[PDB]
């Protein structure tokens, strides 16, 4: 500290007195993130784990809003054969809130999963399920042989093959009108060049892997300027006390020490402010208790020493800090032999103005030599 005092005054010699060199502060340990129990989960499991599945031509549409897209539990399960995402990474959308989400479920053949693509053209894409060029969602499919098959086969599925014109993107229409070719019109009968739009669709246990039925659920996420209704799973870290650490309480960032408090908040109140409109009390989102927010150390470093003549040792005074927190106030990085002696060890005295290191407390009273504060003075005499 003598060298620091010398070079703060731009002189190799110093006089008797106290000089302020620098300041100290306490680093946050890692971080703090807190959140309540849970927000309401989206009914994605109901669509995925559904006993009955609608046909591809009559795919059911469900509105998903006012919940959380907790798809991370199933993403890592790897229980779905296809999890391809178009226009966005599967994990990137997790940390984002989407205003409108829709769920579409249908059962198609294994080889027909490729037809569910943005802008895809085919007998199924252009007649049963059409996807627009703007497809921000992902296509999810998995095997359904254990549920959509039985002895003797199944014949409860239907699909559309013939229509007057190509289906518009995300357009569904059901009608019993028989498609009639322009060259050979039928005028309302089942004659030549006239086939019913609906045809029998079924599966049997003897079908191959590409012919087995597959349960396909289409989840799409898009953004609106309206307040968001769907978001991603929230993460919550452990809560620590009596330690200076960064905190993030429901988006409120800050640095300080979170300790227990005796003040009681109102049932609806969340934050707390003082006369100087600074946050100093934030409730725990998990459980109902109030934690105060306090600064870690602040303060400054002051060096107390006599003149360079007839004396060489120095004493260091830290302002507005407790003697227990001194070793972690900007340390563990300096040159050890001549800095740990002035930071820890003996000759530790706690004063009103702060913690004093390197000076031995004496019960005797003498005339003031070096001003410190609260009637405490330091002298080089024995």
């Amino acid at each position: 500290p003598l060298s620091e005092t010398k070079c703060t005054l731009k002189s190799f010699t110093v006089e008797k007195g106290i000089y302020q060199t620098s300041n100290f502060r306490v680093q946050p340990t890692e971080s703090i993130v807190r959140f309540p129990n849970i927000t309401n989960l989206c009914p994605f499991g109901e669509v995925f784990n559904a006993t009955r599945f609608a046909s591809v031509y009559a795919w059911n549409r469900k509105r998903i809003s006012n919940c959380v897209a907790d798809y991370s539990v199933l993403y890592n399960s790897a229980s779905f054969s296809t999890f391809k995402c178009y226009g966005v990474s599967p994990t990137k959308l997790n940390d984002l809130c989407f205003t409108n989400v829709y769920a579409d479920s249908f059962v198609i053949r294994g080889d027909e999963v490729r037809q569910i693509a943005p802008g895809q053209t085919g007998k199924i894409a252009d007649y049963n399920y059409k996807l627009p060029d703007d497809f921000t969602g992902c296509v999810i499919a998995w095997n359904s042989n254990n549920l959509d098959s039985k002895v003797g086969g199944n014949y409860n599925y239907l699909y559309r093959l013939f229509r007057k014109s190509n289906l518009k993107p995300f357009e569904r229409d059901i009608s019993t009108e028989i498609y009639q070719a322009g060259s050979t019109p039928c005028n309302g009968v089942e004659g030549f060049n006239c086939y019913f739009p609906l045809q029998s669709y079924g599966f049997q246990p003897t079908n191959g892997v590409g012919y087995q039925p597959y349960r396909v659920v289409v989840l799409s996420f898009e953004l609106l300027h309206a307040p968001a209704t769907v978001c991603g799973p929230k993460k919550s870290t452990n809560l620590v006390k009596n330690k200076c650490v960064n905190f993030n309480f429901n988006g409120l960032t800050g640095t300080g020490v979170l300790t227990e408090s005796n003040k009681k908040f109102l049932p609806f109140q969340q934050f707390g402010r003082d006369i100087a409109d600074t946050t100093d009390a934030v409730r725990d989102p998990q459980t109902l208790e109030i934690l105060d927010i306090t600064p870690c150390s602040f303060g400054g470093v002051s060096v107390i020493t006599p003149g360079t003549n007839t004396s060489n040792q120095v004493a260091v005074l830290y302002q507005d800090v407790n003697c227990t927190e001194v070793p972690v106030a900007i340390h563990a990085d300096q040159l050890t032999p001549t800095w740990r002696v002035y930071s820890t060890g003996s000759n530790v005295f706690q004063t009103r103005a702060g913690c004093l290191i390197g000076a031995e407390h004496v019960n005797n009273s003498y005339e003031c030599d070096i001003p410190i504060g609260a009637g405490i003075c330091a002298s080089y005499q024995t």
């Epitope: 966005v88 409108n100 969602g137 898009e222 953004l223 609106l224 300027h225």
Partner: nanobody, 121 residues
Framework: QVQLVESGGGLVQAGGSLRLSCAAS????????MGWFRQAPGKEREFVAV????????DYAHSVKGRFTISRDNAKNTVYLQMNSLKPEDTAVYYC??????????????WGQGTQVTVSS
């Protein structure tokens, strides 16, 4: 009423690059996303690209994925759309459209006048 003003465009050859700018004026405080549309002579309009308010979450059409680039300047209320690896099939009149991304169809509350872009072989 939101007003859209377009600028840029022109004639470009195969493998060239082009830039498009669409500006929004009026009650733009409730506007977050703007998209571009194309239609060929005798063909319906189709989605091209879109940029979010924060600059992320952009989605491109399958035929144009990995080739286009879009950027939004909130300070100037103008969105710059960059074209790379252009192909003669990209010859159409480009329309910038202000709307909200909705599942099923990108609804547009107001459509801009637009400008033409020609790509030769």
């Amino acid at each position: 009423q939101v007003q859209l003003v377009e600028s840029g465009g022109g004639l470009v050859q195969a493998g060239g690059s082009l830039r498009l700018s669409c500006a929004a004026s009026g009650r733009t405080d409730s506007i977050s996303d703007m998209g571009w549309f194309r239609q060929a002579p005798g063909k319906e309009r189709e989605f091209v690209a879109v940029v979010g308010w924060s600059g992320g979450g952009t989605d491109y059409a399958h035929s144009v994925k990995g080739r286009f680039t879009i950027s939004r300047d909130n300070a100037k209320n103008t969105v710059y759309l960059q074209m790379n690896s252009l192909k003669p099939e990209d010859t159409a009149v480009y329309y910038c459209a202000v709307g909200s991304l909705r599942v099923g169809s990108f609804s547009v509350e107001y459509w801009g006048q637009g400008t033409q872009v020609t790509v030769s072989s």
